[PDB]
Ligand binder design. Sequence first.
Ligand SMILES: [Mn+2]
Ligand SMILES: [Mn+2]
Ligand SMILES: [Mn+2]
Length: 430
Amino acid sequence: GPHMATGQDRVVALVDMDCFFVQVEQRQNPHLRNKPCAVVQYKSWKGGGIIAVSYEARAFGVTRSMWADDAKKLCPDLLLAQVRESRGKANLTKYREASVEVMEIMSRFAVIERASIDEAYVDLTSAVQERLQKLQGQPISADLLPSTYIEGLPQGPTVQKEGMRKQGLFQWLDSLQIDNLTSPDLQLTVGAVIVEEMRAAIERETGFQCSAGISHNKVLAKLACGLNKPNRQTLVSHGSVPQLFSQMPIRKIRSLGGKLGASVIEILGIEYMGELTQFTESQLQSHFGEKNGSWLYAMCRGIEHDPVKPRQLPKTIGCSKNFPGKTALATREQVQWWLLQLAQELEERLTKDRNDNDRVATQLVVSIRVQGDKRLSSLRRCCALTRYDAHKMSHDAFTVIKNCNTSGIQTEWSPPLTMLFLCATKFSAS
DNA sequence: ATTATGACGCT
DNA sequence: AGCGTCATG
Ligand SMILES: [Mn+2]
Ligand SMILES: [Mn+2]
Ligand SMILES: [Mn+2]
């Protein structure tokens, strides 16, 4: 009744760059613009592995994780850009620097949570209160929302996509209570006005397009962002959740796409998010644990409390490389040379980080994989990180892993190593 | 041989 | 602390 919390207290946006690494390469090389194109790392094995795909190329069925040679079978005119190689490994610096460009623009509008290289959440609650007070009670014009979709609309009693978008928006704005500074639908609408502004600033000042979702929490914002890509934004209201979730596969919700979501489906015998509403909180907690159970109980009703953390910088800085199959490292000389390559990239990135961001990492995590181990990581050990020196870091990592060589021969390495990873963690202000 | 990361939960 | 899970540019 009057005391149930509906989870409509916040306005939260998720901004996600469209096919980000492709756009970075297309800005640099105008010959790639408005073409089917993709970004690859390496080249010798099956033409390299695709990690990003332009929307033109997605129309041919090109996806991430495809080998470029197979993608060329689907799309013979596919254009390819390769990630830079430094010290024998992929080097993602260009895309990290482009990410910082975008994140710095977003930070002008509100504090953001960097969620990945290409995406950030925005807590717009306060910016919305301010813009509302500025607007007094002036209605919101459709012209302020030129790329916005309202999920669920139009409905009730033209065959073009843009025409449908405008119809849905008109129904939404016609139903608005613009006289109530506390109406959640109004607050989301003003949030969407602000996100149109943020996205226009990003495009004007970087050349990069993005999509976005606007809702009352992070999971709904992320889901909304996905609904109308590319170069569009979507408002998911509290009221739109029952219909949206009634046919939503559970795996589409962030954190339910792996084993936990499979167990929800199998144990409860359901397929769609909305079906979760029929279980009690205690029932869900009995199957999935206290935390997951309470989260699922609120989430299937559109309610989630995870805050937008004030964090625009990555918490860890890491360097990793796989050595698959016949290229696994089988001598100490090899292991030490590759630890040095990784350590040198880490030193470069860490020194830049210290100059830009006034912090220093204090812990070094060393991770390896051995041949014949299914797990991603086979051993993960930490050591102190007291100096930004690649030779010291590689010697320290070798010291923490050298007891892994089950070879009686001290020159050989067995079983051979199929992955090396160096990660700097536990930052302190300096 | 589906690679390079990066956040977070569990014990 | 070390491991597992979820996410994917
Ligand atoms: Mn993206
Ligand atoms: Mn993303
Ligand atoms: Mn993606």
